[PDB]
Amino acid sequence: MKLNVDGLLVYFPYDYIYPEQFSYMRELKRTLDAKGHGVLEMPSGTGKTVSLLALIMAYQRAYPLEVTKLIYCSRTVPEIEKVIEELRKLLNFYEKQEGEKLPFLGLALSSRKNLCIHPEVTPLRFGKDVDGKCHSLTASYVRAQYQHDTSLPHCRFYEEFDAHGREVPLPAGIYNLDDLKALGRRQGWCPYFLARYSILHANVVVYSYHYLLDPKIADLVSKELARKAVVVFDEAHNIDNVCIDSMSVNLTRRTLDRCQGNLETLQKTVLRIKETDEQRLRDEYRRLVEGXXXXXXXXXXXXXXXXXXXXXXXXXXXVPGSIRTAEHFLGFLRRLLEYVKWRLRVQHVVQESPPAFLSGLAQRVCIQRKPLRFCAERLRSLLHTLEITDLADFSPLTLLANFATLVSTYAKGFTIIIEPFDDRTPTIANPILHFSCMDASLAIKPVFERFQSVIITSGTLSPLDIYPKILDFHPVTMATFTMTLARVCLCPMIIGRGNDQVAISSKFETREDIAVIRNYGNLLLEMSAVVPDGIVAFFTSYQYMESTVASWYEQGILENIQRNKLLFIETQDGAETSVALEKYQEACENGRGAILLSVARGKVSEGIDFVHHYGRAVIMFGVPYVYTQSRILKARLEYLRDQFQIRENDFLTFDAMRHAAQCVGRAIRGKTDYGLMVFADKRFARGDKRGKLPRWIQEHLTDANLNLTVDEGVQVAKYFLRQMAQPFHREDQLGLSLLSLEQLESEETLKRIEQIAQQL
Amino acid sequence: XXXXXXXXXXXXXXXXXXXXXXXXXXXXXXXXXXXXXXXXXXXXXXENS
Amino acid sequence: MDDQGCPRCKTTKYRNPSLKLMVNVCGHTLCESCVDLLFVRGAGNCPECGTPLRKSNFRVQLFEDPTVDKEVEIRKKVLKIYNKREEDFPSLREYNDFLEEVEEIVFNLTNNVDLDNTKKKMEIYQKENKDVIQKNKLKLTREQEELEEALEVERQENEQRRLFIQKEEQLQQILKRKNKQAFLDELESSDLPVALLLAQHKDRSTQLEM
Ligand code: SF4
Ligand SMILES: [Zn+2]
Ligand SMILES: [Zn+2]
């Protein structure tokens, strides 16, 4: 539908919109006029991906100067597939309207799990083993040995892509992972390296977060592309958690024992290759002395492992010290390994700053700072040198070498915390070593430096006052869009009152209180007896879901929940969860009642979305606090007190509410979807915790619904479902919660859309 | 159960519900933050029950 | 602390993870129980390769590779000398080659002939013990002192941050409690219309917090 969004025509790929839609489109015109970042909040009602891709395609169709390339970033591979197919719908609409005058290269991109063909690599199930066999079958040196012989191993895909495939760009076709694999089958190529080679020619690229924010993966979108690039994150609550997962490094005693075995293996390899060859070691010493390890770096496609984990602006251009002879570098890694192993021997929890660890190094095993920076460059050049094949075998030592880089680079923001035993362990032999970071800003800092205008957008983000206060961030637009409705469409209730008038809570900190778990089971039973077609029940921790569903069996509850609906409990297997989800979705459609109870942290509620009739009543059990984790929490909170200015009790409440309202706000797809969404404990009524739920849920949280009983909540659920199971046809929306062609041109509608959207 | 998990899998893992590979870059416990997820130690009696 | 186990008097490391191992000239292993059990039975006779220990030649450290102990001790005794920093050379390649020469001298004292090594040490140690070696001893002592001073400054700042936030909490708690008790003792013993005095109380609370 041909929108006027105050400067430009926009072909919306549906012949109807919401008003929330056009408010979002106004504010995103605002963010792309002035080159600034902006944080938006469209709730899950609209097609925010639909709108988002529509306006970015409108700018790229209308302005070939300011915006070169869209980099969408959605976090899970099914969301990659969804965003590609909505882009494909919009191109099909775009080509219905005009004809085959498209040229538009949509492109997904994930990994060698999902773009490899070869029938000996394909039956591997893991990412590192697929990377190892792809490093076996092609390299910089195995490819040359095949190039001057015949029977040496090769893929036939990368070789044929090397033969012809690097001169024909992909003509204007929006490609999924499946379509791209099919084109790799067709002419006979690698679609992995085709996708990476065709990053340069695309207009929309849709990959994951860790393919952009990791400094040791994202070396594939250069500066000149980034100066006119628009990056759009999507579902971006845990950006700070992605950063802290993206730069912290964990060392384990098993990692160090396999590092010792690796060190002996590489010592034997240096001995036998010293018996074999000498001339390329002379060339090694040349390209260390002469250059800065870039001699054979021009032809480097599959010879690249994970790069140096320092950021793009803190790397150096000097010569690697005393390291040069590989015998002495094995001695260097030997010293570093034995010192970190001796440091890990301490049988109490020890927190250090990284300069204290560097001084303990530089005093007690004589290793200085700059040869400890260049350890990543040295191990990558050495491991390229000695022709060795299966790099999965060398996963620990590279880890250790990469750990060395971080210890020798960053200070005052990061923290080296040593644990002799974990929290749920105590006194079992797992001494681990978190080089943990707590600057969230030091991983998105080159993302704001390089890129023009990055757009954090999610359905839930609250409060918006804190994402500039964590990410070292100053946006143009800080927008919240109010859910305008012609029908209530949702009701949140805070069931914080047992049927015995017992205060429902989780104050006990996972050590079971009996009557509260009793009232949780009573809530689940009676809400099962009311709600149709699938109830989703998020607990706090898997130990707590474990303990709760344990004491729902010895206590006589869970058979009654069986009598009403079919349970599908969760486990932390990767395949058992998928089978329980599949049976849960085959039981919401074959008549019976299905109820999926999970944990509000894991992968069950990150990508796997619950649409019109899969979850009607999202039961958020408890307030999700990170309670199991170590002094990483205390140290990140001490950091946010000190060098940012964010309180203890402010950040804990913010984190708990972003997880709770993250897991709740998936139930609703459109305006014609209705989701009961209950919150079950009293703490969600206490003003600060309720104050950090998003605006489109606080708008429909009535003071009567605030602190309901179990049975009052059940009767509100019954009245909700009965008032909201009637024919709510399209003719009930054209006034309020929908807009036609000609309902847009009225300036009264423009006054309405001015009144809907607000800023912070 | 192991035949449903290993010899079989999720049939409608086509665009959702594929919980094993709903993450494009899954690694080992080496270079992460939450590496203490599945512990090879700590097997109790009531917990296994 | 879980290594294969002490050679001679095998009890220490298998039972007690509270020890440390001492190396000899030839450099294999000796624990404190080995040390004492060996000193009572010869005092300077290697347990396996019978090397002629010069004079009591034992050094206690905490590592579980003997070549690591050898390299650490020899590396300290070499890097006591050869102290020319990057400040001291004109170019960068000469400094990196100098560090590689130091690595060559350490690996030669590891296994090669110790004669030419000692002559090279004679020349460089004399020619630079004139000027540079003592100067860099002084400078490294200065940097050790200032790093210990800077770590104590960091810990003073952390103690002040802890204690000042504690005094923030206790000052606001005692002060708000005295505000409330004073407002009760002023509702009692005054004669005002009620809404004005209650507005003064709310003004006291807002001027207290904000
Ligand atoms: S080169 Fe291509 S076909 Fe061969 S393993 Fe790598 S991705 Fe698969
Ligand atoms: Zn002994
Ligand atoms: Zn000996």
Adjacent-strand bridge partners of A230: A70
Number of Cβ atoms within 10 Å of the Cβ of A318: 12
Mutate to test the interface with A, among B1, B6, B16 (most CBs of A within 10 A): B16
Q: Which residues of B touch A127 (CB under 8 A)?
A: 25-27
Cα-based torsion angle of the residue sequence B3, B6, B12, B14 in order, rounded to the nearest 10 degrees: -160
Backbone angles phi, psi at A494, to 5 degrees: -110, 90
Decide if A561 contacts A524 (C-beta within 8 A).
yes
Q: Which ligand lies nearest the alpha carbon of A160?
A: 1
> Are A322 and C100 an interchain contact pair (Cβ–Cβ within 8 Å)?
yes
User: DSSP alpha helices (H): ranges in A12-47?
Assistant: 19-33
Q: Which residue has the tokens 């979705």?
A: A585
A136 CB neighbour count, 10 Å cutoff = 18
Q: Flag if B19 and A436 touch (Cβ within 8 Å).
A: no
Cα radius of gyration (chain B): 15
Residue bearing the CA closest to ligand 1, atom 8:
A116
N-term to C-term CA, chain A: 30
Nearest chain A residue to B49 by CA: give it. A550
Output the CA A331–ligand 3 centroid distance in Å.
21
Task: Give yes or no for a contact between A746 and A754, defined as CB atoms under 8 angstroms apart.
Answer: no
The string of DSSP codes covering chain B is -HIIIIIS--TT-SSS---SSSSSS---SSS-S---SS-SS---STTT-
DSSP secondary structure string, A133-197?
A: HHHHHS-SSHHHHHHT-SSS---SSHHHIIIIITS----S--B-HHHHHHHIIIII--HHHHHHH
Please check whether residue A685 touches B, CB under 8 A: no
Distance (Å, whole) CA A300 – CA A302:
6
**Ranges assigned E (strand) in A605-744:** 617-621, 675-680
Helices (H), A476-603: 514-530, 542-551, 558-564, 576-587
Q: Residue A178 is which amino acid?
A: D
CB A609 within 8 A of CB A49: no
**Does residue A610 sit in helix, strand or coil?**
coil
Other C-beta atoms closer than 10 Å to the C-beta of B34 total 13
Contact map slice: A 530-569 vs B, CB within 8 A: 546, 550
Query: Measured between alpha carbons, how far is C117 from C129 in angstroms, rounded to an integer?
Result: 17
**Euclidean distance between CA atoms A294 and A278, whole angstroms:** 20
SS3 assignment, position A536: strand
How many whole angstroms separate alpha carbon C6 and alpha carbon C11? Answer: 7
Cβ contact B35–A608 (<8 Å) = no
Resolution of the structure in the document, Å: 3.7
Any contact of B with C, at least 3 CB pairs below 8 A? no
Q: How far is the C-alpha of A240 from the C-alpha of A247, rounded, in Å? A: 11
Q: Ligand 2 centre and the CA of C37: distance in Å?
A: 7
In sequence order, which ranges of A671-739 are alpha helices (DSSP H)? 695-698, 710-723
Q: Say how far apart CA C80 and CA C101 lie, in whole Å.
A: 15
Q: Is there a contact between A483 and A45 (Cβ–Cβ < 8 Å)?
A: yes
The sign of the dihedral angle between the CA atoms of B34, B39, B41, B46 is positive
Cα–Cα distance, C35 to C9 (Å, whole number): 10
* β-pair partners for A480: A758
* Residue A155 CA, closest ligand 1 atom number: 4
What's the CA gap between A231 and A222, in Å, rounded?
13
- Of ligand 1's atoms, which has the minimum distance to the CA of residue A190? 2
Is any Cβ of chain A less than 8 angstroms from the Cβ of C143? no
Tokens read off for A670: 């459109």
HSE-CB at A171 with a 13 A cutoff on CA atoms is 3
**Number of Cβ within a 10 Å radius of residue C77:** 11
The distance in angstroms from the start CA to the end CA of chain B is 17
Closest-CA residue of B relative to A395 is: B30
CA A243/CA A58 separation, integer angstroms: 31
Give the distance, in angstroms, between the CA of residue A39 and the centroid of all CA atoms in the same chain.
17
Report the DSSP pairing between strands A479-481 and A757-759: antiparallel
- The sign of the dihedral angle between the CA atoms of A650, A655, A656, A658 is positive
Ligand 1 pocket residues where CB is under 6 Å: A 112, 116-118, 121, 134, 137-138, 155, 157-158, 190, 192
Residue owning tokens 């890129």: A451
CB distance A632 to A433 below 8 Å: no
Q: Which of A322, A365, A641 sits opposite C72 (nearest CB)?
A: A365
**Cβ-proximal residues to A338 (8 Å cutoff; 6+ apart), any chain:** A365, C63, C64, C65, C68
Number of Cβ within 10 Å of residue B45's Cβ equals: 6
Q: Which of A29, A51, A63, A74 is nearest to A476 (CA)?
A: A29
Task: Tell me if residue C150 falls in helix, strand or coil.
Answer: helix
Half-sphere exposure of A578 (CA within 13 A, CB side): 22
Contact by Cβ (8 Å): A56, A70: yes
> Using an 8 Å Cβ cutoff, are A191 and A180 in contact?
yes
Give the whole-angstrom CA distance, residue A465 versus residue A653.
Answer: 14
Pick C96's closest partner by Cβ from A321, A331, A334.
Answer: A321
Instruction: Say if CB A107 and CB A71 are below 8 A apart.
Output: no
- Are A41 and A71 a contacting pair, CB within 8 Å? no
Respond yes or no on whether the N-terminal peptide bond of residue C90 is cis (omega within 30° of 0).
Answer: no
C-beta atoms of A578 and B25 within 8 A: no
C 35-64 near A (Cβ less than 8 A): 62-64
Q: Looking at ligand 1, which residue's alpha carbon is closest to its atom 1?
A: A158
Shortest Cα distance, chain B CAs vs residue A133, angstroms: 15
Considering only CB atoms, which chain A residues are within 8 Å of C161?
Answer: 642
The answer to whether A19 touches A41, Cβ cutoff 8 Å, is no
**Do the beta carbons of residue A669 and residue A44 sit within 8 Å?**
yes
Using alpha carbons, select from A356, A372, A359, A342 the residue that is nearest to residue A251. A342
Ligand 1 centroid to Cα of residue A243, in Å, is 29
- The sign of the dihedral angle between the CA atoms of C193, C196, C199, C204 is negative
Identify the CA nearest to C165 among candidates A78, A658, A645: A645
CB-CB under 8 Å, A402 with B26:
no
Ligand 2 midpoint to CA C7 (Å): 6
Q: C27 to chain A nearest CA, in Å?
A: 16
Q: How was this structure determined?
A: cryo-EM
First CA to last CA across chain C, in angstroms?
57
> What is the dihedral angle through the alpha carbons of A535, A541, A546, A548, rounded to the nearest 10 degrees?
-60
Burial call A627-654: b when 16+ CB within 10 Å, e when fewer: ebebbbbebbbbbbbeebeeeeebbbbb
Q: Classify residue C31 by its DSSP letter.
A: B
3 state DSSP class of A535: strand
CA of A259 to the centre of ligand 2 (A): 28
Give the pair of three-digit tokens for residue A480: 């919240």
C-alpha distance from A66 to closest chain B C-alpha (Å): 31
- Which residue of chain A has the CA closest to C161? A642
Residue of C1, C151, C165 lying closest to A345 (CB–CB): C1
Q: Please tell me which residue of chain A has the smallest CA distance to C64.
A: A338
C-alpha radius of gyration, chain C, whole number: 34
Ligand 1 centroid – CA A283 distance (Å): 29
> Which among B5, B34, B39 has the least Cβ separation from residue A575?
B5
Q: Are A359 and A113 in contact (CB under 8 A)?
A: no
The structure tokens listed for A580 are: 């329980």
On whether the CB atoms of residues A686 and A500 are closer than 8 A, the answer is: no
DSSP element (H, E) containing A207: strand A204-207
Cα C45 to ligand 3 centroid, rounded to whole Å: 9
Tell me the one-letter amino acid at A100.
Answer: E
> Between chains, do A211 and B22 touch, taking CB under 8 Å as contact?
no
Q: Burial level of B22, CB count in 10 A (0-12/13-18/19+)?
A: buried
Structure tokens at A27: 């504010």
* Residue A622 falls in which region: left (phi positive, over 0), alpha (psi -120 to 50) or beta: left
Residues 6+ apart with CB under 8 A from C75: A366, C106
Handedness of CA C16, C21, C22, C27 (dihedral sign): positive
C-alpha closest to that of A403 among A478, A266, A308, A468: A308
Chain B CB contacts of A306 below 8 Å: 31
Helix (H, G, I), strand (E, B) or coil at A23: helix
Residue A180 amino acid letter: L
CA nearest A235: which of A650, A665, A675?
A665
Radius of gyration of chain A (CA): 28
Are A418 and A346 contacting, i.e. CB atoms less than 8 angstroms apart? yes
CA distance A678 to A536: 10
Residue type, A727: P
Amino acid identity for residue A341 in this structure? K
Ligand approaching nearest to the C-alpha of A132? 1
DSSP-H helix ranges across chain C:
12-15, 32-39, 66-79, 92-111, 114-129, 132-188, 194-209
Residue A9 bridge partners (DSSP): A4
